[PDB]
C-alpha cells in the first residue's frame, strides 16, 4: 500500500498534465486562504444538537400561539444548481477530489457564469466547516450585511 | 527513525470475546459420570483369581474413559484408593480395566460388598 501511493504521486508529476487538470495545482495563497476560511467559520451550518435545540424552541412557540439564516451552502449537487441559477457569489473548490472528474468542470462553469471561484487545499478542511468528514466544494449565496466590505 | 530495513507489522490491540448472548443456553450434562465410567465388574474365572492373588479388581469401563477418570470413579463409587490402573481394549471393542487397590484395602472384602463373590 505504501509503495503504490508513493509511485502514484511520482507518476502524476512525470507525465504531462493537461491544462484542465493542471489548474488545480494553482491553489489559493496561504495568506488569503486563512482570511477566507475565517469568514466561513462565521457562517457554519448548525450542528445536530443545535438543530434539535431550535426545533423544540419552535414547538413550544407554536403551542404558545423567524429570520432567514445566512449560512454556507455545501453539496456538489446543490452548489451546481446555485451556480446555474446565478445565485452563487463565491465558490470554493477542493483541490484533492477523487475522482477529479466530479469538479474538473466547475471552474469552467463558474467562469461562464461570471461567478468568482477559488481552489483551496483540503476537502477535509472544507468538510470540517459543514460538520462533515469531507466536502468537495462550498458556496456563499449571500453574506451578512455587517461584513459585506471585507467580503 | 527506523533502524531495520525490513518492515514488520506493528502490534495492535486485540479484545476478548464478550458475546451479547451465549451460543449454548446451558452447559451439557456430564456423560461420563461415575456410573457411566464403571459399567460392571468382570466375573470370569481368570478375573476372579486376580482378586486375591493381586488384590486387583477387573472392571468393564466406557471406552472413552482414561486411567485418570477411572481412578476418580472408583474412589467416588467404592471409596477405595488405587495403587495403579492398567487398561486394555478387548477384541469385542470394550475396555477392560485392571484396578489394583493399595494394601490398606482388601480387594476380596470390596468384592463381597459389590456382590460378585
Amino acid at each position: 500500500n505504501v509503495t503504490l501511493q508513493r509511485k502514484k504521486r511520482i507518476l502524476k508529476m512525470r507525465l504531462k498534465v493537461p491544462p484542465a487538470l493542471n489548474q488545480f495545482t494553482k491553489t489559493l495563497d496561504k495568506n488569503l486562504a486563512t482570511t477566507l476560511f475565517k469568514m466561513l467559520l462565521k457562517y457554519r451550518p448548525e450542528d445536530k444538537a443545535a438543530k434539535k435545540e431550535r426545533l423544540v424552541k419552535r414547538a413550544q412557540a407554536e403551542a404558545e400561539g423567524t429570520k432567514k439564516p445566512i449560512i454556507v451552502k455545501y453539496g456538489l449537487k446543490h452548489i451546481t444548481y446555485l451556480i446555474e441559477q446565478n445565485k452563487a457569489q463565491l465558490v470554493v473548490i477542493a483541490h484533492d477530489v477523487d475522482p477529479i472528474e466530479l469538479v474538473v468542470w466547475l471552474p469552467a462553469l463558474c467562469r461562464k457564469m461570471e461567478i468568482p471561484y477559488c481552489i483551496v487545499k483540503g476537502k477535509a478542511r472544507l468538510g470540517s466547516i459543514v460538520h462533515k468528514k469531507t466536502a468537495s466544494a462550498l458556496c456563499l449565496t449571500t453574506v451578512k450585511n455587517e461584513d459585506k466590505m471585507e467580503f | 527513525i527506523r533502524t531495520k530495513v525490513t518492515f514488520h507489522r506493528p502490534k495492535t490491540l486485540k479484545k476478548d470475546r464478550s458475546p451479547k448472548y451465549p451460543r449454548v443456553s446451558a452447559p451439557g450434562r456430564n456423560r461420563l459420570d461415575q456410573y457411566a465410567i464403571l459399567k460392571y465388574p468382570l466375573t470370569t474365572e481368570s478375573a476372579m483369581k486376580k482378586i486375591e492373588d493381586n488384590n486387583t479388581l477387573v472392571f468393564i469401563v466406557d471406552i472413552k474413559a482414561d486411567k485418570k477418570k477411572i481412578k476418580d470413579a472408583v474412589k467416588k463409587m467404592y471409596d477405595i484408593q488405587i495403587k495403579k490402573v492398567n487398561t486394555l481394549i478387548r477384541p469385542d471393542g470394550t475396555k477392560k480395566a485392571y484396578v489394583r487397590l493399595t494394601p490398606d484395602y482388601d480387594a476380596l472384602d470390596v468384592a463381597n460388598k459389590i456382590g460378585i463373590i
Binding site: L21, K77, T80, P99, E101 | -
Partner: protein, 203 residues
Amino acid sequence: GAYTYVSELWRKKQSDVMRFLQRVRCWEYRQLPSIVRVTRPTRPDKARRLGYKAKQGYVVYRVRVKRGGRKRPVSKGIVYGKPTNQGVTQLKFQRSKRSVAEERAGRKLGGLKVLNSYWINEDSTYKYFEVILVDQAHAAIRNDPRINWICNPVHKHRELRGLTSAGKKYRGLRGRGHLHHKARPSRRATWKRNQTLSLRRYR
C-alpha cells in the same frame, strides 16, 4: 445537478483530460489484485443509474479480467474429430468479459448478491469493471422496497444464471421481434418446444 457534467465528460474518452486520468488509473489497477474492494464507485453517476445507492448494504468491487479470445483448452491443440471441429484458436467465448467479471466477483463474494456492473478502464492485456453488490442480510436493504426484491431466494446467484444486465445481452434478450425471437423464453426452451412431437389423443 452535477451528474450530467460527469456523464458527458465520460463520453469524451479520447480527450486529453480523460486520457490522462484513465492512463494513471490503469497503472494503479495493474499493481493490485484481480478483485479488490473499493471504498466508493469510481463513476458515481454511472453507478446510480444502474441501481447503486449511497447507503449501507451497497458495496463496490473492481474486477480485472484478461482480454482476448478463448483458446480451446485441449492438450497440445489436438482435436479428435472431423475438420469442422479441428479449430483451436480464433474461437470466442459466448459470454462477454463483463459477464466474466460479474461471475468472478459473485463466486468469490458468496455472501452477497450481484446487482449490476459497468466498464471503467482497459488496456491491451486487461479489462476493468466495477461490480455493484448488495448485502441482502443488512436491515437497511431489507427495509428498502426498491431493492429488497433481491433478498428473495429466486435471485440467488443472478450472475451465474445469466440474469444480470450483461447476462441478458449475451443470451440475446436485449431486443425482440424478428431478429431476437428465438431467444425467448430461452434459446433451449425454444428448441425443445419446436422439437416436440405432439401426439394428441384424437389424431
